Design a protein around this ligand. Sequence first.
Ligand SMILES: CCC[C@H](Cc1cc2cc(-c3ccccc3C)ccc2nc1N)C(=O)NCC1CCCCC1
Length: 369
Amino acid sequence: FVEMVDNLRGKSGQGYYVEMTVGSPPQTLNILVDTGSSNFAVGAAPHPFLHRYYQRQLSSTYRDLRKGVYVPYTQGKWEGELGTDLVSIPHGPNVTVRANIAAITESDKFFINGSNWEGILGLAYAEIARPDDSLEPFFDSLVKQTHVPNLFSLQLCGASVGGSMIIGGIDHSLYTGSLWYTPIRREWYYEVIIVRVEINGQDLKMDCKEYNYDKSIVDSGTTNLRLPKKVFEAAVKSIKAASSTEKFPDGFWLGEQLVCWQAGTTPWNIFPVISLYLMGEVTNQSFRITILPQQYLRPVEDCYKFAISQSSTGTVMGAVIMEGFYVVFDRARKRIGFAVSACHVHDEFRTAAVEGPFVTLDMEDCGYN
Ligand SMILES: CCC[C@H](Cc1cc2cc(-c3ccccc3C)ccc2nc1N)C(=O)NCC1CCCCC1
């Protein structure tokens, strides 16, 4: 899989993208890797922000589906025209597939000014595809039409950031130690269940049901570790108490302002390790993933933003989490694998860890219904 190593690029806070081609002859586009959505959508009109866009008139293999899509989000939206065409991943497997493409013809607050991407690769399941679950997502199409195994893995590293998307397999040089798997609870988002949360080694004492209300997901499209309201409130309270050597304004924890120490005077050791215990493969068995402050304190263009925030969507395990680990999306076995990333940023002291097994009872009770 050396072919596919280091095939992800991006800037600080604007996601990870992969190179793709679309149409015949192939048109090159940089496409955002997003495990929290299910649509394959690309710019198809000359928006001022775009380096390039999908030109349907140029592709002999384009077929119109005569159907539109309006995709609203909390803030902003994109609208598009549905069709199919030949899609390929230059630094992926040596295959070409007919996938659904949403050609974006109108948008608001989707494209980033300065960004180097022109579309989005939704890698989640059909249920959350717009307009409905009959629009087959790209990966489902890939597996159906080829001999590529039904799995992919992500190593998100990190001005410029980089990483790897291994399609149809695992590259063991991207992780140290051993992979531990948590089950995909249901195939819509990549849903998982958190059964315990520790900060610096001390339990939060919360009913695990509230760790997963109403969802817990693994999402390469989200920057922050997003926690549910109550969980966030208890977490920061505990993180504030853990770091009392220095004090910061009430706004910094809410991500409303910035914190600064220059000269390279970053006292990481004042800040606690966060740990998430996830449901294991076996009854009553769990494992834990541990992230360093150098994961939830990201540099801003030395100054840092607190990258843990509220959510009424549930727990979102974003780039803050994923950058510490090699993440295997084992779709074939309905499981997600975590192992310590070979590229995660640590100091000479603490590291990111994936440890187990642990004994945890009543894990099913942690899922919301
Ligand atoms: C708990 C899940 C968090 C996850 C965050 C997430 C938001 C996104 C939002 C957009 C998007 C769309 C239109 C306009 C502007 C933006 C910024 C694109 C991609 C997105 N990718 C994401 N992973 C989420 O809200 N997913 C549900 C939907 C998936 C399909 C697109 C709308 C959002």
